[PDB]
Structures are given as structure tokens and as C-alpha cells.
Design a protein around this ligand. Sequence first.
Ligand SMILES: [Ca+2]
Ligand SMILES: [Ca+2]
Ligand SMILES: [Ca+2]
Ligand SMILES: [Ca+2]
Ligand SMILES: [Ca+2]
Lengths: 96, 98, 98, 83, 86, 54
Amino acid sequence: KRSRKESYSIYVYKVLKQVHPDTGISSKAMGIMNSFVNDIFERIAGEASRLAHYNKRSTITSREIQTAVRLLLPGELAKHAVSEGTKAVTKYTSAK
Amino acid sequence: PHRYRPGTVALREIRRYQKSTELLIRKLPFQRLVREIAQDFKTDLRFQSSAVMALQEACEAYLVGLFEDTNLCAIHAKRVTIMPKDIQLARRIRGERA
Amino acid sequence: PHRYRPGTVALREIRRYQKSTELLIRKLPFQRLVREIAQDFKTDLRFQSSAVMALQEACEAYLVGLFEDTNLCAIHAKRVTIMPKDIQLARRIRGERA
Amino acid sequence: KVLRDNIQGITKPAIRRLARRGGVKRISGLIYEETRGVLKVFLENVIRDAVTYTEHAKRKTVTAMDVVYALKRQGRTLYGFGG
Amino acid sequence: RHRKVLRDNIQGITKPAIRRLARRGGVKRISGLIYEETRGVLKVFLENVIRDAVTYTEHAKRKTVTAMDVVYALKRQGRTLYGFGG
Amino acid sequence: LAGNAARDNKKTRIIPRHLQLAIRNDEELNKLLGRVTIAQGGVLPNIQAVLLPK
DNA sequence: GCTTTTTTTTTTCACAATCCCGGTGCCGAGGCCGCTCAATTGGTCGTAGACAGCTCTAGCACCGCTTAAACGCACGTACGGAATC
DNA sequence: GCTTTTTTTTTTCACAATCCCGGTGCCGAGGCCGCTCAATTGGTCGTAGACAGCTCTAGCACCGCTTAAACGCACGTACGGATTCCGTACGTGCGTTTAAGCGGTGCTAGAGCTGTCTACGACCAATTGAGCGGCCTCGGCACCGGGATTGTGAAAAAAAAAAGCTGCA
Ligand SMILES: [Ca+2]
Ligand SMILES: [Ca+2]
Ligand SMILES: [Ca+2]
Ligand SMILES: [Ca+2]
Ligand SMILES: [Ca+2]
């Protein structure tokens, strides 16, 4: 019993061990990281939802995400954010 | 020779323009400025005329209202002349500016 | 007989609290306020513990932030002491009160 | 005295400490009431919305989410309580 | 394509016009240093508003910024504008 | 409210300015349309006290 | 407590600016028309959620200690702001 | 140049705060356990949207005259800001008082979870009228000129406040 409430935590931990494999993290800190991921996910999806909606299109595609990201993140961060979202899709396409 | 006291015409201008709603920037200078800035982001762009008018409506309003905030900021420091630092405080408290 | 001059503990207290993260309002009084105010919208309300702490993080955060902006207005009026008219101006400019 | 105006429970010492953390040095006497005013309007606004959430969800227990959702609406997005 | 590169049009925003806007804002007396400072502000407004409109254009593949591009862009900056569609 | 400001301005049809005056002079409507800009609307007659003559 | 000026107040015209009307003319508010495509009708099927019943979570009340914090009061320094230039 | 004051500067001493040593013990990050549902899959079907081709809107350029606005300079007033200076509202630091905080026990409201059943919403196709675009008109309203009214400002002259000037006591 006790509900079953999902969260991005196991992934926040996985990324942490990529960037700093010996540093850990508190529950309040991991609660802020989960608040952070959900916040921006809703930001980027909402701006995609509207993009798509303004252009009479039914599908959010990776292109909507990339236009939403130019709109939401500041210059130098958008740049890496595109660079990584492009590269991840290319790599995914490449595999199968 | 008749001569109006400094402030008496400013005060008239103040009433003249508050009563009205027509745009206060010269429409072509502004249009040239839209186009100039837009080049930075993409070349050989056309603008709908309504898009340019929508931009001069949104601009004038933004400044006209910043000038309100700015005037309070002058008066808050027992002055009557709005100064650069006034705008800058207005914008820093608005959070437009670090 | 050791006596620190006005404002010299202030600065200690600033440095001190800016270094720290802990709620500054006493938790029980705060909570008794949250129930007092909640009544005016619905009777016999229960709160999760974390609901009150979510309310108290949010409050202090706002207050701290407002004080920064207040200080700035007070310094803008070539003063060192914040006063209501500083708060009220920073709120006028935040668009919080008309 | 000591009677049912819980707002006064917000002590001068605690108001001083906030404005410290906010880089304030010298604090007018009139301010601790101004602050008290402002704090209440803040809570009124947030709590009205949070309980509006509560009544919609058909519950008697105000959740931390209800507050989170309220604070988002008020533009005061809060991290680390369920965001 | 038949001449279009632009000049230095920020001085087009004349001292008369900045003075008139200050007047609408109920400002009585204006320092020397306002006018240049104002143009900076105005520029930074326009740069931000057009970048975003220009994005909405580039997405819909157009080469023509619509009023809706500017409208959608303005709502994004929390500067919602009434009377040009949407 | 627009139409009252229309009538008070001595005109038959409502224009932006009437709407604006009607929105800004009405406490609640102005709150609801607080971050909203009405094109060709202008501002309410407001001159700060201390800016006036003695 | 004066005598002698500056400061502040008052009254008298001159002049500009804004205000209000009717006259005039242009164009877009208003509205009618005819055709369209989206709202409506009447039907079917599937499931979202209302509902009763039960589980056990966590919110509340209470109590009794130990301080740390709030409190009130004495004292004076550095501040706000009035006044001048 | 000298001496005599304020002010400024330097030097010395007091005290918080940090960091280095020595330590202990609690509590939750972390990670393993054991079950479960949400991600994955290949299949099938329908239509979103890429594309290419077609129409024709409306956006861009260019001109030349008219005149409103911007421009730049002369002129002086009221503003900004520096300085001074006075009264006290604040900050500091004591001792006394207060209730928050903590840890704990005991009760139950109510949050939430499970299974059942059907009222209500999706979806469909056929039907038709509400609302679209088009297009025509005539009355509101923008613009003008002329006459009435309001308010400003200078100049002349008063009322008063304040300043500089007295002897006395
Ligand atoms: Ca008609
Ligand atoms: Ca150690
Ligand atoms: Ca005083
Ligand atoms: Ca129940
Ligand atoms: Ca029509």
C-alpha cells in the first residue's frame, strides 16, 4: 500500500553520478530538483502546445520542442539545449 | 513680451497628451527602427503593416507606463526632474534588469 | 564598558542571516496566523504539516525580497532607514497595489 | 491582553531578522505594522486560492500541493514541496 | 533584391517624441541624460519583442512577420495586447 | 461602463478610449485586465499633487 | 520696543489658450443578401466517475520539562530633514 | 610667525567570528528486496501535413510637393544639491519574563483506496439554419472657423513679516 507517486529522482541521481560520482544529495535538495524538472517540462510542452496550435498543426514534433526552447531559455543556454536535443535525436534516429 | 513660467507649458503638454491616444512617435522613423533591429535576427523579412502598428502600440505603452513608475521614483527622492537612476530603479524593482 | 556604535551589530546581523537559510518567523505563531486567516474562507479546516511550511517558506521569501526592494528605495531617497513609504513605492512599482 | 490577533504573533524580532536577510540596516518603528499589514494580504491571497483548491477536491485537509498550485497562480512558484 | 539594408534609425526617436511620452506619463521636468537612456531601454524592448515574433515567423516558415507573430510574442513577455487579433 | 464613458464624452459609438476609461476607472475590471494593454486607449487624466503650482 | 526694509499678499488689466457651437463632407458602421459549412438532431456504445464500504495515515490534543527568544527599560549616537545658500 | 582649536589621522586594545585541533551519536541517504504496472512490441488503419502548383493580396519602392515638426541657439528662472544644524527616533545591551520547542502518548477524522454499476459524453451521419463574406448607404463624426470663457502673469501697490538698530536695567 501507500499510494505509488512517481518522480524524476532516480534520473536526477543518475545524472549526478555522471557529473560528480562521489557527491550525494539531501531529500529537500532532490525535492527541488524534482520541482525544477516538472516546472520546465510544463514550460516547454505548453509553448509547443501553443506553437502547434497557432499553426493549425495536430502533432507536437521535435521541431516544436526546439522552437519552444529558443523561446524559453536564455541565449547561451538555449544554444547548448538545442545542440543536445538535436544530437540526442540524431543518435536515436541513427540507432533504429 | 509675454513669457510662460517654467513648468506651466510642461503641465499643459501633460494635460494635452493624457486626454489623447494618438501615437507619439513619428510612424516611419519607428518603422525603420523595427526593420533595422529585425535584420539582426533574420534578413529579407516583410512585416504586415498591422504587425508594425501592433509593435508601436506595445512600445509607446511600455515606455509611457515606465515614465509613470520613473516619475514616482523622482518624487520619492524629493525631486521633480526624472533622472537616469530613476528609470534604473523602476526597472530594477520591476525586475526587467539585474 | 564595551559599546558598539549604532548599526555595527546590524551589519553583523545582516552578514549572519544572509549566510543562513533557516526560517526567521517562529513556526507556531506563524501556524496560528495560518489557521486564523484560513477560517475567514472555511471552517474546521485541517492542514498537512508541510502545507504550513510551504506557506512559511513562501511568506518569508516574499518579505525578504520586498525588503531588498524597500532598502533600494530608501537608499534612492538618500536615506539609510527604510520606512513605510519605501515598502509602498516598491509595491506600487511591483504592480502589487494600485 | 494576549488575545486572538495572531498577526501580532509576528514579533518585531522576527520582522527585524527578515529585513536583515534582506540587507536592511536601520528600521523605522512604523515598519513592523506596515510589514504586518503586507504579510496578511500575502497570506489571504495565497490561502484563499489554496482552499479554493481544497473545496474543489472535496476535502477538509489543505494539502501542500493546494499551496504550491496557489503560489504558481500568484506567480510565486515554489520548489521542493511537490512542484 | 532592389536595395533594403538599414541605417542608424535610433536617433529617429527624437527628443520631442521621448518628451511627449514622458508627458503622457505625467512627467513635468526631464534631465538631459534621459533621452539616450530611454533609447537604450526602447531598443532592448524592441530587440526582445521582435526576436520572439521573428521566431514565431521562422517556425511557420513565413518570410513575413504577421501582427499575430507580434501578439503571440507580446503575451509571452507578459505584455498582452488587445485589438490586433487573437 | 464603456457606453456610459461613450455617452459622457458626447458620442454615439464606443471607441478604444471609452473602453480604457471604463476599465481603468472600475476597480475590479482594472485588476482583471492589469497586465493587458488596450490599443489606441491612452491613460487616465492623472497629475501628481506636488507637480502642480503653489 | 523701533525704524527701515525685504518678504509676502493683493488688485488691475492684457493676452494667450482652451472651450463650445454650427457647418461641411467623407467614409465606415450598420445591415441586408445569398450561400456555406458548422451546429443540431437522433441515434449507438463504452467507460469515467459517483458511490458505499473499509483501511490506516497522519493530523490534533495534551502534557511537562528546558531553554532560547521576546520583552521592557536606560541611555545616547547617528540619523532624518528642516533651513539656507 | 605663534599660539590655539577643531578636525583628521594614526595606534592600540577589545571582541566577535573562523578554523585548527581533539571528540561522539543520531538519523536518513542509500541501496537492497520483492512485487507490479507502465513501457515495449509488431501489427493494422486513417489521416496530417509535405509537397507542388496555383491565385492574387498586400507589401515594398519610388516620386514631388506641402507644411508640420524638429532643430539649434539665446535667455533666465527655479530646480538640485551641498552645507549646516538641531531634536530625537532609533540601536545597543542589560535583566526579567515568556512560550516555543521538543519528545512523548492517545484518539479518530478523514484521506484515499477498491469494486461495482450506469448516466453521460464521444462519435456518427444526415439535416438545415446561423453566421460567414460581400456589398451598398447615409449619418456620425472629424475638421474648421469664429466667438465666448477661462486662466496666467506682469506690474503697481498694499499688508505684514522680518531684519537691523536702539538704549536701558
Ligand atoms: Ca447608418
Ligand atoms: Ca572533526
Ligand atoms: Ca526630528
Ligand atoms: Ca470518504
Ligand atoms: Ca458584414
